[PDB]
Ligand binder design. Structure first.
Ligand SMILES: NC(=O)c1ccc[n+]([C@@H]2O[C@H](COP(=O)([O-])OP(=O)(O)OC[C@H]3O[C@@H](n4cnc5c(N)ncnc54)[C@H](OP(=O)(O)O)[C@@H]3O)[C@@H](O)[C@H]2O)c1
Ligand SMILES: Cc1cc2nc3c(=O)[nH]c(=O)nc-3n(C[C@H](O)[C@H](O)[C@H](O)COP(=O)(O)O)c2cc1C
Lengths: 229, 48, 49, 152, 152, 153
């Protein structure tokens, strides 16, 4: 666990690469961790992108992954929607995460306005309900938000936004910092009972708890309880 | 900025303010609640 | 001084009422409703390109 | 003595302690009221039956002193404020009395399902003559507070 | 009812009320609370207790991945109006605890859900035979215990 | 008082919970039947279920014994828990009764209560005990003024 406690899970590709970091990353004392992450960065970032419950937030416009510090403002607000709003179901994984994506948007506004008076284009978070249609409107109102990358300052802000109290833990990993363990393994199992939200929607990267022995004792899906019982 | 426009832009002020040591970046808890960005160098207080 | 008054007066009344009514709203719709529905005017930051 | 016992229900509200009935008795001798026995009862328990909860409080006598024409202009700017056509005694420089009755119906123990306030705006002359210079009439539903009593 | 997916004290007292009403009347509810999350059960335990008192059908309590101390248990037992309590020992020693909790309440239902080293999620490093084999005698000798096998 | 036979009479003094809609409820018999100085309990036709009558006689301050409560059956499944108050408006015993139905499918909650009317039923009781008129102005609007009438001190 993140608490360190032992757990039995379906050894999916994710839960495998999770055991991985248990042995190589979370095995080391806090200090020496961050250093070791930077050395296996692009590796951990691949295995992150490829087969884990939470993906690397580092995508760019073209499709490839990059550093959060290398994304444009646009690209970030976009990737936020991408990874928290389920397209084919027209829903956010959680209102809180819509707020989040909303607040950062608000920020990009601020970063790119330089005179008092102008109000926000996103005036109510209700606007993000059908997001991708509306978002592009705001982002286009602040042109350069598609030309230049996040301020170092803003990256730091973003990162604290993904941490706030009373928000569902972000469904990805923003970078490999001192908190990478939190980023990775907080609130993990909800994605088992909603693979529709999961990236690619394959259980392959998902966290499902199971005893070692009571795994043969299940052979048919979808048996009504009163039957089994 | 000075030689041409005759005054600083906010962008200018922030650079001056930075190099003169009036403000410095902060990225941790300020009075319990977390915070990141510009802080008055003299008082731990944050600055907008 | 007569005109002086009127101008100062009629303006004072006008902006007075504004506060009054927008305050009556906080009474009726509660802090919460009123709060969430005010023109959010972004605060200008600076970016060093 | 021969006493005629009149009562009516002043408020039934459901506190957390249970459910509350306020009864206002009126003993009269010779047709004139002699004393008012007001009482409260508690049906202890959990109640969400907010449909029939309500109250007729007699709101406190308020004294609104009008000094600026801007003061006046706001007292007049109120919808619930209704000037009488008795006479144009310039409300300026004098004070007013707002003895108001009001009636409320609850929905949430917090939210006022619907509220109405009425009453008489009094003025005392240099002669101690009391006049209804105006009258109050506010009404609204889904209210959180009383915008009239507040103003006062 | 798994309490471990209940963060807001409201969303829990909410889904609890849904269950009471779509249920075989008279049926009893049991909530499973995590011990290594005292932050959570900080509200959960007094929450349950408060619900029971209002009429809600909770007569069952379960405490997971952790065995309370004797007076820690005693409290739960005589605070919240549950009709039965339940612990989930995993250590040879863990079990002895429960027995003593049981001996402490010689008149109370105490389900002893015994799990092994092969359960889902949390898991002792214990083969679930030998502990019982070495304890069963002592266990049984307290009548309040309901020895429930579990795992695999 | 429960007996050995699994009966209505057993489950009434066994289950600590009487269901109330979806609520639980502490078995009132635990209160009523708590040992008291000089109380009396009779069980009529004990071993014959449907025809059993459980009754309580306590010492009134002025009397030897009195009818406290009794629980017969009525209409197959309806159990009738009745309390009797001597000192009333009419100067004669008035009874208040709580109706229960009992479905031995659920051995866990064998006993339930019939509450649809319970409010009025009791209001009635009170009404009779206070004013000695056994019909209540149930459907008076609360806006209505209520009459107490003439009265000489
Ligand atoms: N013994 C076993 O076999 C077993 C198995 C699995 C889990 N558990 C236990 O059960 C508990 C739950 O574990 P977990 O892994 O699910 O939790 P977790 O990874 O430790 O974190 C879950 C957290 O996500 C946050 N969250 C999720 N959705 C939210 C929303 N909509 N709004 C606000 N916050 C939201 C909550 O934040 P907050 O921090 O603000 O509450 C919640 O506590 C733990 O104590 C765990 O040890 C035991
Ligand atoms: C997905 C999942 C979630 C679980 N959550 C809890 C819990 O919140 N509290 C607890 O005492 N045990 C919990 N357990 C373990 C069970 O309570 C039980 O002890 C064990 O699963 C039974 O063994 P088995 O998996 O072989 O059937 C969980 C098991 C799984 C697979």
């Amino acid at each position: 666990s993140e608490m360190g406690e032992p757990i039995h899970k379906l050894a999916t590709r994710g839960v495998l690469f999770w055991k991985e970091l248990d042995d190589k990353i979370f095995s080391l004392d806090r200090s020496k961790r961050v250093a070791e992450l930077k050395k296996r960065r692009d590796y951990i970032i691949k295995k992150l992108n490829d087969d884990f419950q939470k993906v690397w937030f580092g995508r760019n416009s073209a499709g490839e992954p990059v550093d959060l510090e290398d994304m444009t403002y646009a690209e970030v607000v976009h990737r936020m929607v991408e990874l928290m709003y389920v397209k084919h179901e027209k829903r956010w994984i959680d209102p809180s995460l819509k707020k989040l994506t909303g607040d950062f948007i608000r920020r990009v506004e601020e970063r790119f306005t330089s005179v008092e008076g102008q109000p926000s284009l996103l005036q109510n978070y209700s606007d993000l309900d059908e997001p991708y249609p509306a978002v592009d409107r705001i982002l286009a109102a602040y042109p350069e938000a598609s030309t230049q990358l996040i301020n170092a300052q803003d990256v730091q802000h973003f990162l604290l936004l993904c941490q706030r109290r009373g928000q569902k833990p972000v469904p990805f990993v923003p970078a490999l910092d001192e908190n990478f363990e939190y980023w990775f393994k907080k609130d993990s199992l909800w994605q088992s009972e909603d693979i529709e939200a999961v990236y690619g929607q394959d259980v392959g990267r998902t966290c499902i708890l199971q005893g070692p022995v009571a795994a043969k004792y299940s052979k048919v899906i979808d048996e009504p309880i009163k039957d089994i019982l | 900025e000075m030689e041409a426009y005759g005054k600083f832009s906010l962008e200018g002020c922030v650079e001056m303010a930075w190099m003169m040591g009036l403000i410095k970046n902060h990225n941790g808890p300020l009075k319990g609640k977390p915070y990141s960005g510009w802080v008055d160098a003299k008082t731990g207080e944050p600055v907008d | 001084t007569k005109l002086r008054k009127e101008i100062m007066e009629t303006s004072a009344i006008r902006q007075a009422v504004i506060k009054e009514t927008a305050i009556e709203n906080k009474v009726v719709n509660g802090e919460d409703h009123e709060a969430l529905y005010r023109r959010v005017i972004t605060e200008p930051r600076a970016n060093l390109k | 003595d021969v006493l005629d016992t009149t009562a009516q229900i002043n408020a039934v509200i459901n506190q957390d302690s249970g459910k509350m009935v306020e009864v206002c008795g009126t003993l009269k001798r010779d047709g004139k009221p002699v004393m008012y026995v007001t009482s409260q009862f508690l049906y202890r328990g959990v109640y969400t039956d907010y449909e029939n909860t309500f109250q007729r409080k007699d709101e406190v006598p308020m004294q609104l002193h009008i000094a600026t024409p801007q003061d006046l202009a706001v007292l007049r700017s109120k919808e619930w404020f209704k000037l009488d056509d008795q006479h144009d005694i310039e409300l300026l420089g004098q004070t007013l009395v707002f003895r108001l009755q009001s009636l409320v119906r609850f929905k949430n123990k917090n939210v006022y399902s619907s509220v109405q306030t009425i009453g008489q705006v009094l003025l005392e002359l240099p002669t101690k003559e009391i006049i209804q210079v105006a009258s109050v009439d506010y009404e609204a539903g889904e209210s959180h507070g009383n915008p009239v009593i507040d103003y006062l | 009812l798994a309490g471990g997916g209940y963060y807001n004290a409201q969303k829990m007292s909410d889904a609890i009320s849904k269950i009471e009403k779509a249920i075989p009347p008279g049926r009893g509810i049991t909530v499973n609370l995590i011990y290594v999350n005292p932050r959570a059960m900080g509200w959960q335990i007094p929450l349950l207790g408060r619900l029971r008192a209002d009429g809600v059908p909770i007569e069952g309590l379960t405490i997971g991945a952790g065995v309370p101390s004797i007076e820690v248990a005693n409290e739960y037992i005589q605070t919240l109006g549950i009709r039965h309590i339940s612990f989930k020992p995993g250590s040879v020693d863990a079990i002895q605890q429960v027995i003593n909790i049981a001996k402490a309440n010689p008149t109370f239902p105490i389900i002893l859900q015994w799990t092994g080293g092969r359960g889902g999620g949390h898991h002792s490093f214990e083969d679930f035979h030998q502990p019982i084999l070495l304890m069963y005698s002592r266990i049984r000798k307290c009548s309040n215990i309901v020895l429930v096998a579990g795992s695999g | 008082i429960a007996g050995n036979s699994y009966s209505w009479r057993h489950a009434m003094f066994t289950t600590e919970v009487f269901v109330q809609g979806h609520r639980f409820q502490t078995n009132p018999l635990k209160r009523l039947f708590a040992p008291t100085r000089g109380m009396y309990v009779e069980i009529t036709n004990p071993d014959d279920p449907a025809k059993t009558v459980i009754s309580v006689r306590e010492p009134s301050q002025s009397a030897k014994l009195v009818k406290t409560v009794e629980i017969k059956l009525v209409g197959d499944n309806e159990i009738a828990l009745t309390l009797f108050e001597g000192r009333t408006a009419e100067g004669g015993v008035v009874p208040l009764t709580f109706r229960f139905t009992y479905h031995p499918e659920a051995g866990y909650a064998p006993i339930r209560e019939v509450m649809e009317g319970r409010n009025d039923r009791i209001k009635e009781f009170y009404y009779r005990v206070w004013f000695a008129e056994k019909e209540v102005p149930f459907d008076t609007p609360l806006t209505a003024v209520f009459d107490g009438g003439r009265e000489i001190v």
